[PDB]
């Protein structure tokens, strides 16, 4: 067998340790980004919703990198923490050196460059955490970026990771909307997919986290929705669902 | 399992009862079926249902019955099993728990199965080998399908590989209605609601829920079961074991 | 038991870990590159669109310098790092020596960078073999092929990735002087070379052409489509 | 040398559209079979004694079978009773003293033990069943593709028997021993059934598991008897299917049951290449795993040709489809190329299962003419057991 | 050791043997000895008081013992007067006494191959190399 | 906590044919002897019906199935599969009840925890302040106890001592009374024995805590 | 919604669209099958003659007299003579399987003819010795020795000159010139163990020995030395060694010793210890007789059997060098119809780490290729093609995309 070290090449040319890190994201949480013009969002899930969990951060799965960048996380907690620390440090280094915000891709390229280095040098376990990126820049505007524990990344319009990733991406493709992807429709689609990809039904507001990024007067306000607006969003989805039963 | 019964009758009953359809169509008769799925779904209940209405010699080879201490004995028993099935043709062999004998071929050596491997290879040749077999069909049922080798699961031996997924709501309601037909249900017991309280209940767990609902009346010396007798019985049968450790549970964000 | 280390020689003098590195390229998408008289065209096949992802972040043909470009194979994770290292190296060489890099020099640098990764334990080789093709030679076109081991070779035309054997074998029989006599014929040579795709769809073929003292020009999916149609019309002669 | 006891195959009819000429050929075969039956039955009925009768009274009933161990005199011998004892028997006159050889099975008088016959052809019924009497009905035309593979097996088991001059005029000893290895469902046992349908030599078949026995001495003795029968019966072919059952890699086993496995393997090795050279008996072995066999078993000299059966190519898959859809009733819209072009690892057994499933979906819709949609459905309903296992989007 | 199988015949032999060792008491002239190359598979019932007892321990010969043993099994052969048996012992390690005689036998055989009467030290060295089936090749990278 | 003792009581109180087998008894060598032993056990229950099969310490041979890579785990998984087949298979056994005792309850194979094979998963927890009183009363009912021996002061202590520990506390106290040639167990012996059965830590290493 | 095929649909499916000749053709086919069955039944029982002599050599009148007068005598062995008074000895006889008895002579045979241990013939009634018997010769062990000398000579074994000389200096030289081994006082090794990779020429060198032997060569099958009944293998090897001792200058060759020479381990609850005890009896016999053994896995043999008291010499058959590979090619191409320009030296370098059997396969496959295309001379081009498919096609992968590193 050829998965003893992350630098061992299998006879078929497959990095077994890397793919072991890749498939381990199935144990990570569900975070998805829906198609949206003039905006973009991530929809995370809180597995640990135990009542004895006091809530202090409200963004345990949502992290802000730059003034115009936000990222989710799906992987080992410690790896996600160190990766987001390096993310913020690299973004601020770029801001200091160029006096200009990082243009989305070059930050994701920076993380993927750091991440792949763990998959090449021995003695370091590959970073077993994949993370979405949202952001805006003067080059391509709103973008959605998919990190992958192999250091491979990719532009995306609608994708998800974590538990039930395949079901989430298939459902996002079922109603995949190009162009006509207003922020309200994006939020509705995010709630609609989260209703099914999450095993627990009724989509309790406290167990669902949405973070949105919008361009308002050239400020790029990054928003995390409080309990009230998430409650009214799931209420809207519930009222919409009631109409769908008129077929019978 | 209405689809599964109809799919399994296209191999067990149709090729035997009316072989003229297959000869006229110009296709070979399907031979083997593999009923795989989570435990408690009906993969062995379907075998009993098939044996109840089959009008063919139904041989049952369940578990490690072909694994003998003496070498070359399990292969001999498989040979005579297929000999007895041929003189009594048409015949149907049902091999429950095929993982016992049909697991993936391990590398020969100190640590590795080699005799159960040998009876497995004899069976492999018996299903599809030099001597073509006539009117012999096998319905071996398993739980793990990925542990079986490529040779035992290759077509020509297993034409249909029928899956037994956990029943849905409209199916669990059906299971609740066939295992409670003899039960003295009261008025106002919505069997669909109890089915709605069992997401992914295997199928044997529905029967367990019915049995425990009856048990909750046995300890009270009654004959009728109420809605609360079922709802308090669902939580008993459909019990879950949590991680019981947030430190391990927060290993992954 | 001679294949779980990179610095262990097999009884027959084989670096089996190095050989397993050449398996990664054989799993990657087919990339073909042929050198013409004035237009050095390189093409890649099996785009494999996921129908939900923008293709800008998928790019596989990248220009190391203003006059050199390279298309890789194998895993993209190491490909991006070798991309950045080659870009930094060519800029640094332009800094230390006023003359910009030549294709052979950048190929040698990439080969040495890979070799220093295949030479020691605790460092996995770059699992790619890139096609170094460019017109920075100031008059004479050259195209090169690197290897994950660290060996670089100069070919008149090459083929890497999943389908290297078939494309290479078919390419010998139709690579002659008359074929390369015209720039349009030179690009059409890439067109029929990548036409032997896994599915031969014809819409997953991305070809880039660089000319003498010109800039890199990735063919838009209207000129590429036009060239595919022209090749089909030429191939319509069989009827 | 009793000669090649080749299998009895009736002449083939090769209209397959169920036309009248098929009936004419089948009726011709039926008329000849009826005439042969008339000949034999009328020979028994039409047919309506002192020398052999005295012999049969002398022998009596029953008539035991013992093993000769010593010819003491020209009229006296020592035989072993079938329990294991010994007796100083007398040799009677009608017994032919030339066929009387030590180790042979002799007939003994029941009351007064004495050699009264020689029982030649005393083959163990575990081996007389190994001989193929009814040939398989799969000709070489029933295999699509594998032209290279067929040619390799045809130059070692058929050509050396039809044109031995080619081999002898050049100085070769024709290849004697081929191994058929590859993924499951590629056509190895099909090739065995195809050569058995065309060879003129006796074709012994074994799964490599009949030749393994619980008794200590029975295992290697059975393979020795099998090869003795193969050599006795002139040109012969021994097809050891699934050789991985017995011929696995040797190792220092701490189990007695496994040590006999290697012991009968080591007699299969001896019977292939040992001190005494083999006769005119070819050996065809088949296995799904060639990397597990012992190096000595697949060593050249024992196995000369390692015929590899890779998963069928696009052209080979297209030919396999036509082979398996020849008896179908395909619709005019059934373009099989839609299913062949798929990059799925489709074996020949996969193709046959697709054809059977595609026919069954036609019966689902009350049709005996399969359309293109039936095939596209049967492909999905049959392509299980392999799911989809591949690396993710690491490589570009 | 103990394990109806077919070994129930030698078992009676071993038990009868055990009965006779315990039947006779010491101080009589019936001292017994037994030899075996594997006591790991020996039934410890055989190794009990009143039975065999006093397990004598036979080790692999050490360097001086190996030299001495190689000296004894060459007395009948015309060995040259100048053969360093001590150096032979240094070059012979992990060698049992049987191999320490086979080295002398092989040295004599190699001397016969060379067509010489007396056995030189080089003949003994080649015997050491050949008793373990090794072939001596002059490797070029030493010099 | 009384798992084996309850099965013993059932065996003493059953009109059926009790058939006890231990989990370790099915792990015989000579592959095809363990599963054959399971087949013999269930068949023997079958002719002499009604019969009850008590399989104690099933965690030995009924651990969760996995991808075995040697005959060692393959055989024990085969024993588990034979258990699954004989407890609920194509041959439904009637009037054959099975009691099965384990100390883990989570390593058990999910197919064996089905509510068609093991319907009732009864839990035997550590005795509380109420059950401990009953256990002390039943064990000491036969023991000769001095009137000054008040059992309540020992059942009220917060130490989580098991029923086996309770029986230990009683038997060793009686043993200590025997050692001093005294025929009546005194409260001093009870207190002395109580300290020797609850100090289970003893060794430890003081750095795991 | 897989609607079940009802009877009305079934009848239409079996009738509508049917060819008018389908029913008749199928009936004719079933009639053909049944007719074939019954006709093979009518004549399947073929006569199996029981080896009757020609009627000319028949004496039925005296044959009946032989049947009635002579009686079957049970073969026994006289284990002990009691000699109660030296006039009524009261011999004790072993009847092998029946039992052990104390019997006396019949008046026909003389007291002095029956000596202890020799085989005796007793009657079925009183078990009296009626006739002496010659010593037992095993019907299988007698066949074990090779009466026909193998045709392969020493010149057919190439690339193993050192191994051939090391084998000869033990097997042939001590049997033909027992004077060089006496002058120096060297005890000639009484056994070698030919070991090496499969196909290196271990058994070929044994056939070469048998061809030039001047001696009595015995091929030990190995399969026969493992019998179902307990103790029969030890008896087999005992009488094998006894017959070898009776012959002058006997050679024994235990081919594939691993069958009866596995490493010893305790397996009493089974038949493994039977061949184990046969191996122990063989070791006892081993420690003018010379013994040969060949094995491709010498690490599975018992260390006691490999010690230099039973196998004094261990010859290793390694893979031949280039010079030996050309010699093997020339030996295996002496009878081939090759063109007289063949660079066998060039062909040897394209077969690195190749056994002597793979070179024979390459030579055979060159003619195979020269037969595939109708050429009566196998040119050099075929030999390269034969090498590419015998050696390179199964040596390793070493494919071109990964072989661009060696140049
Ligand atoms: N689909 C179903 N419909 C009705 N009853 C069902 C169904 N599935 C399970 N049951 C009930 O649950 C019991 C579980 O036994 P079953 O043979 O179905 O188990 P299994 O897990 O499929 O197979 P196995 O015994 O081979 O592990 C059945 O005997 C039956 O009474
Ligand atoms: N080239 C081919 N042409 C036609 N049919 C083929 C071909 N290859 C395989 N098949 C089909 O595959 C089916 C499976 O039987 P086959 O004898 O090929 O199995 P196999 O490869 O020997 O199997 P295993 O590896 O399990 O022993 C056959 O019935 C045959 O119809
Ligand atoms: N040195 C050699 N010179 C010439 N031919 C050779 C040589 N070695 C092997 N061969 C040829 O290869 C064949 C291999 O058969 P052989 O009996 O020699 O094998 P073996 O080494 O005893 O094998 P195994 O270890 O499997 O018993 C021989 O019959 C002979 O034709
Ligand atoms: N309720 C109880 N009353 C008396 N004794 C008990 C009780 N529970 C456990 N014991 C004691 O604990 C010991 C262990 O028995 P038990 O718990 O049945 O087996 P296991 O430890 O395998 O579950 C027994 O000797 C028994 O005397
Ligand atoms: Mg079952
Ligand atoms: Mg097969
Ligand atoms: Mg217990
Ligand atoms: Mg040999």
**Which strand-content bin applies to the residues of chain D?**
5-15%
As an assembly, this protein is: part of a larger assembly
Work out the helix count of chain D.
Answer: 13
Write down the secondary-structure element order of chain D.
HHEEEEEHHHHEHEHEHEEHHHH
Shape of chain E: elongated
Number of helices of chain E: 5
Can you offer a commentary on this structure?
In chain A, α2 (77-98) packs across α3 (105-118), α4 (165-174) crosses α5 (183-197) and α5 crosses α6. Chain A is globular, with a radius of gyration of 19 Å. A five-stranded antiparallel beta sheet of chain A has the order 3-4-7-8-9. In chain A, strands 2-11-12 form a three-stranded antiparallel beta sheet, covered by helices on one side. By secondary structure, chain A is an alpha+beta fold. Chain A contains six helices and twelve strands. Chain C has a single domain, classed as Aminohydrolase, N-terminal nucleophile (Ntn) domain (Glutamine Phosphoribosylpyrophosphate, subunit 1, domain 1), CATH 3.60.20.10. In chain C, α2 (76-96) crosses α3 (103-118) and α6 crosses α7 (223-235). Chain C has helices at 16-27, 76-96, 103-118, 164-174, 177-180, 183-194, 223-235; strands at 31-34, 39-44, 61-62, 68-71, 131-134, 142-145, 153-154, 157-160, 206-211, 217-218. With 239 residues, chain C is of the alpha+beta class. Chain C starts with 15 loop residues before the first helix and ends with a helix. Chain E is mainly α and 143 residues long. In chain E, α2 packs across α3 (85-91) and α4 packs across α5. With 209 residues, chain F is mainly alpha-helical. A three-stranded parallel beta sheet of chain F has the order 1-2-3, sandwiched between helices. In chain F, α2 (34-47) links the parallel β1 (17-22) and β2 (51-56). The longest helix of chain F has 17 residues, at 71-87. Chain F is elongated and about 60 Å long. Chains in contact: A-B, A-C, A-D, B-D, B-F, B-G, C-D, C-G, D-G, E-G. The complex binds adenosine-5'-triphosphate (3 copies), adenosine-5'-diphosphate and magnesium ion (4 copies).
Topology readout:
The structure is cut from a larger assembly and holds seven protein chains of seven kinds.
Chain A: H1 16-23, E1 31-33, E2 40-45, E3 62-66, E4 69-72, E5 74-75, H2 77-98, H3 105-118, E6 129-130, E7 132-135, E8 143-146, E9 154-156, E10 159-161, H4 165-174, H5 183-197, E11 208-214, E12 221-224, H6 227-244
Helix pairs in contact in A: 2-3, 4-5, 5-6
Chain B: H1 2-12, H2 14-17, H3 20-25, E1 35-36, H4 45-52, E2 57-60, H5 73-87, E3 91-94, H6 99-102, H7 115-127, E4 136-138, E5 141-142, H8 169-178, E6 184-185, H9 191-196, H10 204-218, E7 224-225, H11 227-237, H12 246-249
Parallel strand pairs in B: 1-5, 2-3, 3-4, 6-7
Chain F: H1 3-12, E1 17-22, H2 34-47, E2 51-56, H3 71-87, E3 96-101, H4 129-140, H5 152-155, H6 163-179, H7 187-198
Parallel strand pairs in F: 1-2, 2-3
Helix pairs in contact in F: 2-3, 4-6, 6-7
The complex binds adenosine-5'-triphosphate (3 copies), adenosine-5'-diphosphate and magnesium ion (4 copies).
